[PDB]
């Protein structure tokens, strides 16, 4: 008999939540809310006191959730900045800044994990250390500077290479002792935390990006039918951006809509495509050949600047400067050559994005190869560069960390310089010198500057990939990256407001909200391979912890498991972790994923149909 009462109460509870999204005036919402609340409180002969207290606890939990959400809404930064940028330019441009804030949040989470589980315990152990202490006795080698390094740290050359106080700090791999633990029993071994935190950070980053992509699909944009049957409707009912606040951007939108509608009327073979007989095809072939030549030139230049020696102001930073210059220059050359190619604007944008992505991947792997060769050469050299041996042995992990942090800092500096020159100084030139130049700088070449959203996204994802690659050797790398991100944000915002001009027409290569996160997962997958290979194959250094004098990088976990489950079962795991078993598992995953993709496909179509029937 109580079933009807509980059912109607549950229905009214559901109405309470559903009221937030109803197409009703505020008076109707207020009346319905009051009536539903009165019905909820009015119910006589309620459930038993245990479940009554359960309902009370649920209401208190809902109130606490609302309170914590209200508290959290105060902690979202740059809402005003992003709103102003969106108003001046639009949703497409502000998408980059929203993505930047999200990446900053992910990096903040990574920093919190690294600090809580790795950096802070090591700092506490160092602080509790005393002169003459056993931990000091056994960590003086990798924690206390020799007098030569202490004297030379003040020199600018050491600061360039991070070989001064930075090397003997919690920033790099070598400083972390392999004897650091907490607890008389069930010890909290710091090297184990280091390894597990690196692995868990990789996995957690992958999980977070996947969760964001799933949330974006859940939002409703995934309901697209992958069809062009509604091109006119999608150009008419989404033809205006409601986020525009600047009149000039509004006029640009008007002109773009006129162009799009006229083209759509005249497209579909109404105006057949025609060009020069053979000139443009040969031009495209030659441009592609020259772009491949620029690719191989970039590879060779990275290799050549890798094999540069000395202590000069430039020989130490030659590789980072070269990589940054290539990254900040070659996309401009690609854009210029796109004019020669004369492709479809969307197709041209897709080609340029693919070319920049390929360039980034090639530069990344070439840097990996060059650092490998340099490490091998330095290892062979033994039997200022010599000062790096003061830490104890080569500490090639620390050398990789120093190189990667030099690359990151130089990327920041060169990005700031490029923003200052290409955007600001060019803007001033086009504004003032236009009275004298024969070419109309503003009108013909070069314009004041359009904010390349996709190129900036690619640069940010490349930076995040470098952070992922260097995270193992540089535990505090994301923290520094945080500062970089913040700086970039502000500068980019400034570069948007004071220097850039709204684009005449906006094209999206993907037209999907998860494309940036697709690039992010691609870069994460590419970056997780070299570090995994290093862990599985490369032997750790014999002096610098936390894996000092270990047979392998994973030997710590193996020793821990052996000490704790001497059972062959450990061997059974090893047994599992075997080439003859992981390949059947890989093909089973490939067979299951295929089936799964299809199922969702079909489910979506069916849903499609259900809705249609309604």
């Amino acid at each position: 008999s109580k079933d009807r009462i509980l059912k109607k109460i549950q229905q009214k509870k559901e109405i309470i939540q559903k009221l937030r999204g109803q197409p009703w005036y505020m008076k109707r919402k207020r009346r319905t809310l009051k009536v539903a609340q009165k019905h909820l409180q009015q119910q006589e002969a309620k459930v038993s006191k245990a479940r009554l207290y359960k309902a009370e606890a649920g209401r208190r939990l809902t109130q606490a959730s609302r309170w914590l959400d209200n508290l959290k809404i105060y902690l979202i930064p740059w809402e005003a900045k992003i709103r102003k940028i969106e108003s001046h330019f639009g949703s497409v441009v502000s998408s980059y800044f929203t993505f930047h804030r999200w990446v900053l949040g992910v990096n903040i989470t990574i920093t919190f994990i690294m600090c809580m589980f790795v950096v802070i315990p090591e700092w506490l152990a160092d602080s509790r250390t005393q002169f003459g202490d056993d931990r000091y006795n056994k960590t003086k080698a990798i924690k206390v500077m020799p007098p030569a390094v202490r004297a030379r740290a003040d020199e600018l050359s050491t600061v360039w290479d991070f070989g001064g106080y930075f090397q003997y700090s919690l920033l790099f791999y070598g400083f972390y002792s392999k004897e650091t633990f907490f607890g008389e029993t069930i010890k909290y071994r710091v090297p184990v935390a280091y390894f597990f935190c690196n692995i868990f950070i990789l996995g957690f980053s992958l999980f977070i990006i996947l969760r964001k992509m799933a949330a974006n699909n859940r939002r409703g944009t995934l309901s697209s039918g992958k069809t062009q049957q509604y091109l006119f409707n999608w150009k008419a009912f989404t033809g205006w951006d409601y986020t525009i606040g600047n009149p000039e951007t509004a006029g640009n939108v008007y002109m773009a809509n006129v162009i799009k509608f006229r083209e759509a009327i005249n497209d579909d073979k109404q105006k057949p495509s025609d060009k020069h007989p053979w000139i443009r095809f040969v031009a495209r072939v030659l441009t592609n050949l020259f772009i491949c030549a620029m690719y191989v030139f970039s590879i060779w230049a990275i290799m050549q600047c890798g094999t540069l020696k000395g202590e000069h102001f430039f020989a130490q930073n030659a590789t980072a400067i070269t990589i940054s210059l290539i990254t900040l220059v070659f996309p401009n050359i690609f854009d210029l050559l796109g004019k020669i190619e004369k492709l479809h604007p969307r197709n041209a944008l897709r080609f340029q994005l693919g070319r920049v992505l390929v360039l980034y991947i090639l530069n990344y792997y070439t840097l990996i190869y060059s650092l490998m060769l340099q490490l091998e050469h330095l290892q062979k050299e033994k039997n200022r560069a010599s000062l790096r041996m003061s830490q104890g042995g080569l500490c090639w992990e620390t050398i990789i960390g120093q190189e990667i942090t030099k690359l990151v800092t130089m990327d920041l500096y060169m990005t700031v310089a490029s923003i200052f020159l290409i955007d600001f100084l060019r803007g001033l030139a086009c504004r003032y010198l236009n009275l004298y130049w024969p070419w109309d700088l503003e009108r013909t070449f070069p314009e004041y500057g359009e904010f390349k959203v996709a190129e900036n996204v690619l640069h940010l994802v490349n930076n995040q990939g470098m952070i992922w690659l260097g995270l193992f050797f540089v535990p505090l790398l994301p923290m520094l990256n945080n500062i970089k991100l913040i700086i970039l944000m502000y500068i980019r915002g400034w570069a948007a407001m004071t220097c850039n001009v709204p684009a005449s027409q906006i094209f999206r290569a993907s037209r999907s909200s998860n494309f940036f996160f697709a690039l992010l997962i691609l870069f994460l997958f590419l970056c997780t391979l070299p570090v995994g290979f290093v862990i599985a194959s490369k032997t750790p250094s014999k002096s610098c912890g936390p894996f000092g004098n270990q047979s392998f990088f994973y030997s710590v976990i193996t020793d821990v498991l052996h000490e704790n489950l001497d059972k062959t079962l450990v061997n059974g795991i090893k047994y599992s972790l075997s080439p003859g078993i992981i390949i059947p598992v890989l093909v089973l995953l490939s067979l299951v994923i295929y089936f799964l993709i299809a199922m969702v496909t079909g489910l979506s179509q069916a849903n499609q149909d259900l809705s249609f029937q309604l």
Binding site: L156, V159, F424, G427, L428, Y448, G449, M497, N500
Partner: protein, 48 residues
């Protein structure tokens, strides 16, 4: 090669002056609210 000033190094002094200059210019630009590019209505008038 830079040499060591009394209780200081020359590159350190250069870094200090550059940093204070950067801080000052950042502070100023946080209030200037400048806008370099011209609007199309401000551009088409160049014919005269």
């Amino acid at each position: 090669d830079q040499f060591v000033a009394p209780g200081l190094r020359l590159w350190m002094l250069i870094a200090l002056v550059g940093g204070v200059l950067l801080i000052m210019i950042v502070i100023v630009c946080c209030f200037m609210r400048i806008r370099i590019p011209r609007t199309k209505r401000q551009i088409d008038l160049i014919a005269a």
